[PDB]
Design a protein around this ligand. Sequence first.
Ligand SMILES: Nc1ncnc2c1ncn2[C@@H]1O[C@H](COP(=O)(O)OP(=O)(O)O)[C@@H](O)[C@H]1O
Ligand SMILES: Nc1ncnc2c1ncn2[C@@H]1O[C@H](COP(=O)(O)OP(=O)(O)O)[C@@H](O)[C@H]1O
Ligand SMILES: Nc1ncnc2c1ncn2[C@@H]1O[C@H](COP(=O)(O)OP(=O)(O)O)[C@@H](O)[C@H]1O
Ligand SMILES: [Mg+2]
Ligand SMILES: [Mg+2]
Ligand SMILES: [Mg+2]
Ligand SMILES: [Mg+2]
Ligand SMILES: [Mg+2]
Lengths: 98, 528, 155, 113, 532, 528
Amino acid sequence: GMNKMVINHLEKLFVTNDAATILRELEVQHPAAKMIVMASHMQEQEVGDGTNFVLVFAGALLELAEELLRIGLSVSEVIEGYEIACRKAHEILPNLVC
Amino acid sequence: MMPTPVILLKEGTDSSQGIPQLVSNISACQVIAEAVRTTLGPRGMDKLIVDGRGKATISNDGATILKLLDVVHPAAKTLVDIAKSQDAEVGDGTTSVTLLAAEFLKQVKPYVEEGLHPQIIIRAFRTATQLAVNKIKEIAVTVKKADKVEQRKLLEKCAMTALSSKLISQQKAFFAKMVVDAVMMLDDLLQLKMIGIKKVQGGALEDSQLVAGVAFKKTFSYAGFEMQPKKYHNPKIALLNVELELKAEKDNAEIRVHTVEDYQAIVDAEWNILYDKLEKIHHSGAKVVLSKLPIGDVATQYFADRDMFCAGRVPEEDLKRTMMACGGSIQTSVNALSADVLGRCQVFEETQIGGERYNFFTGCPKAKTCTFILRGGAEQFMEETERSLHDAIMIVRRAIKNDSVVAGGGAIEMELSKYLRDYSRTIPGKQQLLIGAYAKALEIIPRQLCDNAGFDATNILNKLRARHAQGGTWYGVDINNEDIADNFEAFVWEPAMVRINALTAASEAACLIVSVDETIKNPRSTVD
Amino acid sequence: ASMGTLAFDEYGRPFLIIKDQDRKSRLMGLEALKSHIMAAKAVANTMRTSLGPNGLDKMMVDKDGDVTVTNDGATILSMMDVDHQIAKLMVELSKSQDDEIGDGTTGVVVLAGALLEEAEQLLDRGIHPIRIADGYEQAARVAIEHLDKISDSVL
Amino acid sequence: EDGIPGTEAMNGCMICLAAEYPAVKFCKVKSSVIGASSQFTRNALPALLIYKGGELIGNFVRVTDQLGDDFFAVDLEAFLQEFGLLPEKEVLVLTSVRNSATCHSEDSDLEID
Amino acid sequence: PLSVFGDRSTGETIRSQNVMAAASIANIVKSSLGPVGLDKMLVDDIGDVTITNDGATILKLLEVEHPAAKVLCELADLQDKEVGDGTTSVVIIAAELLKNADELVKQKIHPTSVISGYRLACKEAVRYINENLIVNTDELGRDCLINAAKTSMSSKIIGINGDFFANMVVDAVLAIKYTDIRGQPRYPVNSVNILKAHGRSQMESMLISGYALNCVVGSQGMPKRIVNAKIACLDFSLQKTKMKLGVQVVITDPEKLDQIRQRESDITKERIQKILATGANVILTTGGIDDMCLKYFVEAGAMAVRRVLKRDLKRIAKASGATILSTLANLEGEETFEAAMLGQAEEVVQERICDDELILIKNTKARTSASIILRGANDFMCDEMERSLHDALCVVKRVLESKSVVPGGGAVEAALSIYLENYATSMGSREQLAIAEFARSLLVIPNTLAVNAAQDSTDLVAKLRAFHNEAQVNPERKNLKWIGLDLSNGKPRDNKQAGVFEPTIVKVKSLKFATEAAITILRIDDLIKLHP
Amino acid sequence: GHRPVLVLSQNTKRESGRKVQSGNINAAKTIADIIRTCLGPKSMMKMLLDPMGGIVMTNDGNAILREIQVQHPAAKSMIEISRTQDEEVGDGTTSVIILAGEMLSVAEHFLEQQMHPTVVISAYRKALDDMISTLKKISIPVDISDSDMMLNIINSSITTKAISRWSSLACNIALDAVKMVQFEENGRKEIDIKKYARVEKIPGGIIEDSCVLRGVMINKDVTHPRMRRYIKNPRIVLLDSSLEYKKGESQTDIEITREEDFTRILQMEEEYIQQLCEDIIQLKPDVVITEKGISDLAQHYLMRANITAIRRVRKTDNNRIARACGARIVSRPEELREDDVGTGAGLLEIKKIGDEYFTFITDCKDPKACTILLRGASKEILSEVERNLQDAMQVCRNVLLDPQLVPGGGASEMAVAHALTEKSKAMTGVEQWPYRAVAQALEVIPRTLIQNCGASTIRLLTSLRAKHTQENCETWGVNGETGTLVDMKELGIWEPLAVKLQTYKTAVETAVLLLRIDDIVSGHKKKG
Ligand SMILES: Nc1ncnc2c1ncn2[C@@H]1O[C@H](COP(=O)(O)OP(=O)(O)O)[C@@H](O)[C@H]1O
Ligand SMILES: Nc1ncnc2c1ncn2[C@@H]1O[C@H](COP(=O)(O)OP(=O)(O)O)[C@@H](O)[C@H]1O
Ligand SMILES: Nc1ncnc2c1ncn2[C@@H]1O[C@H](COP(=O)(O)OP(=O)(O)O)[C@@H](O)[C@H]1O
Ligand SMILES: [Mg+2]
Ligand SMILES: [Mg+2]
Ligand SMILES: [Mg+2]
Ligand SMILES: [Mg+2]
Ligand SMILES: [Mg+2]
């Protein structure tokens, strides 16, 4: 990954590749992107790593949800399938410990 | 691009990404390097920068020039930062760091334009820097003799080399002897605040002197000060932090009396308190009294009647230097003025120095401090003299820490370039091009020396390369003879840590600049 | 020959390096030295009329309208409202001469102006200014030694 | 300027006329941009200005007085024609295929010899 | 001191400014080089949209202020005018040459030495190209022209349909072949009329065995199709006669006015009667025809077309054997029209093309003509089709005129770089550096080609240079001079066998023009910009 | 004033990279989404407000797109595609936009990954060739001599428009107009719906009274009341030249000296008019139609022969009358011939409709031009009816020129998609993914039909795909009114092969054209 020079509203320069720091310095205005940034910051607070994973996974999930909505599925069906698959993933994960 | 009714980031957010933004960063670093390029070498020049208020600063020091420029480019600020870092850690070479970093970026720019992955460039830079630092440590010349004469010669040569680029280069031997004398008197920490530097207008550069003791300017004498003698031949010095004047005993103190006798008693008690303090000071045997706090007119006249010298409102640093020079202790109370807390000096005198009176404490045999009194024709003249002396002092301190030297004038960098080229000739070939570019970028300093001196840099560089290839580690640029010479035998000596830190900082800055692929600028808040 | 540099990148993207770089001027190379020599020569030629017994005075007016008539070079240069930095350097040279000695505050400025005037024609012939300064230092040492040689002692 | 009645009708008329008169160079500009007087903006804002060779040939101001607020392209066309400022209509092909060539050199088939 | 009302930039500042301007112009079009390049879509201030890949069109549409950038744009225009291809390559090469020359100058190398080295390098590169890298097309046959057209049309909107468009281009060029004096065949391109009409797909574009007119019959009563056409080409209008400025009609006896007014149209009636009596079926005129003459032609059962373009009329007349007549005046002072002035064609048809009609003159005799009707999705795509088609026609004309071709894909650039790097060591001491920098700057073409494909440019260029160095050093490895770049797979490839060819004139002229432009810009070291 | 050094202009904007491609694709998607709901038998109409004050109420894609002004050049390209589709075949305007949007979406999917646009373009062209082959394979022929099948084709073309309520009347009108305007001369067949087959809309009355006239109707009245307004079997003469005395071309000033010359000149003007009228009368006609003015004296002299005269008729109307009544327009009356007289018009009658006079020539034997008289509720209703009739006539002409027929209702889309998917299984390259993606992008038509019908998109589309996986199910589509699968050889919805071929070609080439752009430059002066 590559570092990004981010200058905030106070002319302070940040050179980092940490996703949480980049999102914090960026002035995100869209409420949905604000919610995703909140999720990333919560992941940073709880664990301390994996914020970029959270962001990219949420983006991919929402893109594929848009595809499913376009092909004819409803929001409720997509949400139910996502929850079922998340439960399946959390069940599978302990078996993947090496 | 689409309007996107609700935008992601707020309006005014500017984003630049990809190869063009990194090429722009390299160009900005080139501009910053060019801003200080001409101030390198014995044939370097000075830059004059005027601030908003109208005051001008004239300097040859690269760090000062870079600080005075209001650089706002995020990538270009890294060069200023590494210049500051080199100034802090070493104190000399603040131009070479910027030149080397910009040359690294310029050399790797063509590979950036053709799509080479920045991680490969960063890895090559790290490998080349590690190899160069190891080579510098291996080939640096040190003497395992601990000879006082040899150490003195080494320090003086390093100081002259550090000084032979400034306006005081004509008196470089004299100033270097002064600097080495001053540094060698510091005890073990080599604190800079133990070397006072006073600038007095008027006089030639050769009129500047180093006081083996402490000297400071006269501090707002009261009435009756001119009635005091101004020379003592073995004075005991009372270093105090005491306000010697009639005043309220306490800020919250209140006096309540109901008799005129008690009123007179209170007035006499205030006078008696002041006179008791003065008598305790006088009975200690001291003839010179210095205080960090104001000394009133009553105390001044009292000391004049006793043929004693007084000076109030002395700056704290001057009192600390006086304590270190004489051997007393700053007393906040005069109740115990034993002989152990009184400073001693052989001669105290107040003399005239260019329309300004100065107090002199000389003859101190156990002094751990000095005081430079610089003479010049203008404020900026003396400021630049002080900057040059600071560079020399830092160099001498670092050499005191370790006496490892390498020949200057680009000789060390030509040797490093030859070594790195030889190493790069024996690797697969993707890293070979980048290490060769690093070695070529190492040639900027001798080329810049030749360009500043007005030579033909190409022929001198060719001769240097041929000499280094066939043997001879310390062949650099001979500025006076417009040729090449053995710079180690010409006593163009630098501490090895100077070039080590220069290479490390330049490589780190280049890697940081290369590693950035996107720049985002949030809109300004509270523009007012 | 001013304003610094302006490229705005070879990609069309903004190129801002120094704050207010479009409102800042810059002189480089021999042109700046020529301008400095011109300013110093102007100051020295102004002062050179007030030299010697037949020298004339300068009537100086401050910002409040007060009138000062004087022959002292240091006073004239201190009260003169200059903006050029080299002129301020000459003023400080006069002030330093006044501080150290107290007399000769006009000779120093004329001498400096003459030295820079000669350095101008030296530079026109392709000599590094550092070489000119070194030669000036050598000649100053020679002149100081000669002054010591030809001096006389008074009671 | 925005909001003053008659501006949108004039815009539609100019669109139609430019469709029918390619030669003319119909254009619009706000009074603020040209820096007109506040008096002119408040009282005489809707005005059609006609130029020809850098000099004025049409000085129409407050065209709504003699055109109204519901004037169509027919009204403006007739109103401009009756002062003889609008160039005469030239018949042209409505739409066709495109060629897009203009002379140049060596653009000449030549007999073999 | 100067007191000049303007701005002055001198030395390194102006040199860097010129280099920056040239580099910006190059970087504008560097993304549109090679088969993996992509088009650009330009929008005017009035909303007009142009989608193009041609460097000359991009630089002409762009509004440029810097003088060096203007020099580069005019260089692209000149390369388009004199060759027709390699418009992006010449600009890129010139900018790279200028950049490397400025890099040399910043090292205290005198600009005159750099200019001398550049001239020597250009001369030696031209000589080496002419002596080693040219391929004679005599042993390749018709496939060489097809391969050249395919190479030219790569990176264009018609690249994938090249299998069809190359045959169309070759047939169109061969249809207009003629030999002038000295027996040298000549191919007058721009005589192939190109008509653009949106509609059906690209593959249904038509090559007309004749001429195509963007015109229709004057009157609806005329026939829309004539089998055995006798074309009469006129350069005068057929309207009611009007006397000149110097002649005036003054009537004193009223009885003469009716006769005057009758003759006023009887003159044109008689002229048309003569023209129709000679046997003509199709009448084409550059002037207008009014209703009365149109009715004469309608009653005669003949096709009449008015306002025909002069170039179109000349092409039709010479293809059909007709003679342009600006007047029906002979050398006997009479008014006659002869059958020998009539052109002939196998058919003249007004066909419908996407809710519009145009006239096709099919199979003109005594000369073969060619026209191309391009079908596309919309107007912009048809315009890009026309530009690419013109590029292909110019390339085929250059190949047919001069029968030498060179391998494409950067093989020529790599070979020249290796050869000039070897050759620099035998000339001078600083012109040595100039020639070396010329050789290095010649590598910008394969580098840009590889970059546009997101391939490893460094490794591919290194492999190409190794192949060409082996070809130049080893004496029995001369077959490696054709090793170029295969951008589809990102590997070196023998481009002579693969069919990636270019006319030698493209490379030679691009080198010469780029060198001259670089020298001209490098000649500047001081700029005075007078205030307007 | 202040002079900033620039390469390009201040108002020149340049953007490039993934942003440009994404912006183009989203612009095309938005253009498609604008008219997504106007496709199918259950489409909903839209109100468009003209900048000139008019109102357009339609569900035709071309009108909706042409009424929208856009800034993004990709949207301009899409609108140009819509206009091209309308001008070429006259139908499928809404389908082509949706297809182009879907193809650009599935292309953006790949461009998000590291696939070059040229690979996608080559895959798209291969897919387009395969679609053309499959469409030609699954087509069926039609018998143009069968009036019932032609009426069914026109009906299936117009079932999606507002005129579908009066389906039989509209189909009969369109078929009769196209059939009678069909012409053959000199071995060149033509239809020419644009010039002849004029549609005249008179607001008021009922739409069931609309009919195609066996001749031409114009909005004209006799020049003078004494003219006959009803002629049984008229002989019609058409002219362009005015029937009035006019100035000559040359300057022809007279000079009158005698007394009687003025009256003589006026008398000869009258005599010239009389001579022209006598030359006209020599052919013994009943009606005289002129594109230009007719003098009052000319009217009198024509009345003396009992001839009805109409003046100031448009050139297109006069050509239509010539085609209808079999006359030839003559400029000079003295050159009139017998074969130029129009005999074949079986009735001429000037009747009053509303408060206006209309001239009817509507009993011609074998007329080659016609007037479609449309009567309806108002102006906008009649404009929509005229647009629908234009679509019907275009479809009829397409079938007449190309007698190939293709199943509708999305059946052809699914058949071609299945064939391409089956073909893609044997390529084993990197282009197979874009090939399959653009093959499956054709399913947006059945999906749009199901969405507009209001049924379940996913279940119906899955069932349709499963059905099309069978061995003979190429004609299985969706019923757009009930939202159920149905065989199109039973439902009867069929479309011309030309319309489908044009739609697919235009959509694929639009995607190819918009996939080739990565750089946008805007703001520069037109320079010309
Ligand atoms: N007498 C000399 N001869 C040749 N080179 C010298 C001499 N003195 C210093 N240099 C070179 O000048 C370079 C710059 O030194 P200087 O300008 O004093 O400080 P900085 O390194 O901050 O620019 C050093 O790298 C040194 O090698
Ligand atoms: N099929 C191909 N394979 C490899 N390289 C090609 C191919 N076709 C063209 N090229 C190369 O791409 C380069 C760029 O051509 P292009 O930019 O399209 O022409 P122009 O320079 O006239 O715009 C040419 O130098 C040519 O050698
Ligand atoms: N009764 C029907 N049932 C199902 N589909 C139909 C029916 N009638 C028409 N269609 C479909 O609707 C499409 C026509 O929609 P239309 O509004 O005409 O769009 P366009 O103008 O783009 O053709 C045709 O592709 C056809 O397959
Ligand atoms: Mg992590
Ligand atoms: Mg130094
Ligand atoms: Mg004096
Ligand atoms: Mg080309
Ligand atoms: Mg339809």
